Design a binder for this molecule. Structure first.
Ligand SMILES: Nc1ccc(S(=O)(=O)N2CCCCC2=O)cc1
Lengths: 167, 454
């Protein structure tokens, strides 16, 4: 069988976090998503010559169920920690998301990427250097993505698979 | 038919690829085409179509129109639709009045009636919208319309003013009726804890309206204004999960903690039998939490039957809720679904599909996206109709409504307290297992989950 990677998207609600996985799964060119089917969260990809399947969990909309997160944090193999570049509180929330994941995994070395998402035309409040400094203090990569153009989306998920592979 | 010109009546402009598009299939039971997209004028024309009634489209349109059309703009458009001029000049005028004017005017009143009956909150939130509706309904003249005009006035006035055999006997264990001061996880009867929480959770589930969900409003900055019932339902769930975790880790004596965990799995069994999936997942989330999941000495002592009950319950959420979904589909009401799945599906449907479609450079409202949202809200509504045949015990209810495990602590401080309690009661290896004194003066033996009387 080809390797299956269980990926988990974590981050603040209300700031377009769902666009990351939606854009990955959409071929680009097609704007017609059904979240009720397997193909909406399972994607066969080829990364550095090696074929694999990405099984992505994104519970966007369920952030108020704050006592239900430990389950997916325990099963997930890699985490995309997402904040919106126009929302400082979403950036400041990353620290606790990472602390929970570490606690649940019982480890300081968990495959993880920091993702800065440009979710709309509004003004940037988190500079790339602040986000790069935070990512370096955690020992993880930083990737900026655009929700409108799909730029960086592939790189955010592929970099995470490389972190799992190199763990 | 010879309809008037577009310059005198906007809804007479003929259909084209530039103003209306359809899905390939027909409405399953009606044989009616499914609208994929259209200009608002074409959507209003089809909302009040002369050739036939379209209740599915009317229902969907009224549940979801606010993302592309304001309530004040809709009322104008349906009033404009009702004011049909006669074509520029008999046999033509007699058939036009009976096959176009009369049916369109009657479909407008049907939209007004359904609007006031099922989406009265638009009128409650905007008193001037109700003024204009009452004015317009007062101007309607005709014996044909009179009956429908009177029905709308009765719904308005009522909206402004604002059944089984015997339920099972209430179960009691250590705590007796009225001894509210001793009510707790182990002293209340496990059957009755589950019944009362299912009643509470059923009512919280039933109070959630589509106005709290359409447009993903529970995730936006005004969520506390627009989705209060949804957020009360989610907060109760979270609170019960934290209460179960707190009951466990604050029971420092191992034997007592085994009795606590075992009692919660018995509550889970009753939740499973009542089809309270929200309650099942409250328990599963507590068992899967960081403080509880690591209590190996506690789980070692749990009887096999209860380990298997918990394991089948844990399996419901695996693989994107695959087993949960199959099970919810297989059962019939009464039930308490897990709301979270619907929230993600509504949100991802709204964020993953475009608001507008473009055909020959013209913007068409993507109606199919709205229909997908209305199908999720319709599925939610299907489970809110059937109540439980269980009696309310006012004091147990009040006990569960007023639970506050966190107290005055913030979320981080409290979950850090639970985890550090877990570490104290069962230290990480190779620290030895300490012993702790017992805290419960009453017996730990459960009465079981089989009802005590016929
Ligand atoms: N990517 C992924 C991560 C976690 C999982 S799960 O089976 O743990 N799970 C538990 C939480 C709710 C949904 C779910 O599927 C599956 C795929």
């Amino acid at each position: 069988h080809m390797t299956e990677y269980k990926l988990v998207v974590v981050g603040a609600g209300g700031v377009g976090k769902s666009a990351l996985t939606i854009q990955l799964i959409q071929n680009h060119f097609v704007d017609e998503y059904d979240p009720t089917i397997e193909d909406s969260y399972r994607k066969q990809v080829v990364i550095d010559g090696e074929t694999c399947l990405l099984d992505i969990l994104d519970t966007a909309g369920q952030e108020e169920y704050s006592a239900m997160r430990d389950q997916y944090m325990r099963t997930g193999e890699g985490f995309l920690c997402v904040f919106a570049i126009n929302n400082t509180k979403s950036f400041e929330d990353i620290h606790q998301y990472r602390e929970q994941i570490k606690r649940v995994k019982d480890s300081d070395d968990v495959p993880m990427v920091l993702v800065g998402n440009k979710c709309d035309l509004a003004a940037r409040t988190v500079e790339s250097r602040q986000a790069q400094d935070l990512a370096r203090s955690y020992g993880i990569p930083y990737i900026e993505t655009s929700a409108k153009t799909r730029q960086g989306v592939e790189d955010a998920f592929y970099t995470l698979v490389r972190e799992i592979r190199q763990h | 038919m010879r309809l008037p010109s577009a310059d005198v009546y906007r809804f007479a402009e003929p259909d084209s690829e530039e103003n209306i598009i359809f899905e390939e299939n027909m409405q399953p039971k009606a044989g009616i085409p499914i609208i994929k997209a259209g200009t608002v004028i074409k959507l209003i024309e089809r909302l009040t179509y002369h050739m036939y009634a379209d209740p599915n489209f009317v229902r969907t349109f009224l549940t979801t129109y606010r993302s592309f059309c304001k309530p004040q703009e809709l009322l104008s458009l349906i009033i404009e639709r009702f004011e049909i001029p006669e074509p520029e000049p008999s046999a033509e005028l007699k058939r036009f009045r009976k096959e176009y004017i009369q049916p369109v005017q009657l479909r407008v009143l049907n939209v007004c009636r359904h609007w006031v009956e099922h989406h009265f909150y638009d009128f409650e939130r905007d008193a001037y919208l109700l003024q204009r509706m009452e004015e317009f309904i007062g101007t309607v003249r005709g014996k044909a319309m009179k009956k429908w005009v009177e029905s709308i006035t009765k719904i308005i006035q009522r909206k402004k003013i604002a059944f089984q055999s015997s339920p099972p006997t209430v179960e009691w264990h250590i705590s007796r009726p009225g001894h509210i001061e001793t009510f707790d996880l182990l002293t209340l009867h496990p059957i009755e804890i589950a019944r009362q929480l299912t009643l509470l959770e059923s009512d919280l589930y039933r109070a959630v309206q589509p106005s709290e969900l359409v447009g993903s409003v529970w995730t936006k900055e005004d969520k506390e204004i627009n989705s209060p019932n949804l957020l009360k339902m989610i907060r109760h769930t979270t609170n019960l999960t934290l209460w179960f975790e707190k009951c466990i880790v604050e029971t420092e004596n191992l034997e007592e903690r085994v009795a606590v965990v075992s009692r919660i799995i018995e509550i889970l069994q009753v939740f499973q039998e009542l089809n309270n999936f929200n309650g099942v997942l409250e328990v599963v989330s507590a068992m899967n939490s960081s403080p509880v999941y690591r209590l190996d000495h506690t789980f070692e002592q749990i009887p096999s039957r209860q380990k298997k009950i918990l394991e089948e319950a844990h399996e419901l959420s695996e693989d994107h809720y695959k087993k949960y979904l199959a099970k919810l589909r297989s059962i019939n009401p009464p039930c308490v679904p897990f709301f979270g799945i619907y929230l993600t599906n509504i949100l991802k449907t709204e964020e993953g599909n475009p608001e507008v479609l473009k055909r020959h450079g013209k913007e068409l409202i993507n109606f199919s996206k709205r229909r997908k949202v209305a199908e999720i809200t319709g599925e939610i509504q299907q489970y809110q109709n059937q109540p439980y045949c269980l009696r309310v015990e006012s004091d147990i209810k009040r006990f569960f409504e007023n639970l506050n495990p966190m107290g005055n602590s913030m979320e981080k401080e409290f979950t850090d307290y639970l985890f550090n309690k877990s570490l104290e009661i069962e230290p990480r290896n190779p620290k030895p297992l300490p012993r702790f004194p017992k805290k419960y003066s009453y017996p730990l033996k459960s009465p079981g989950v089989r009802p005590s009387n016929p």
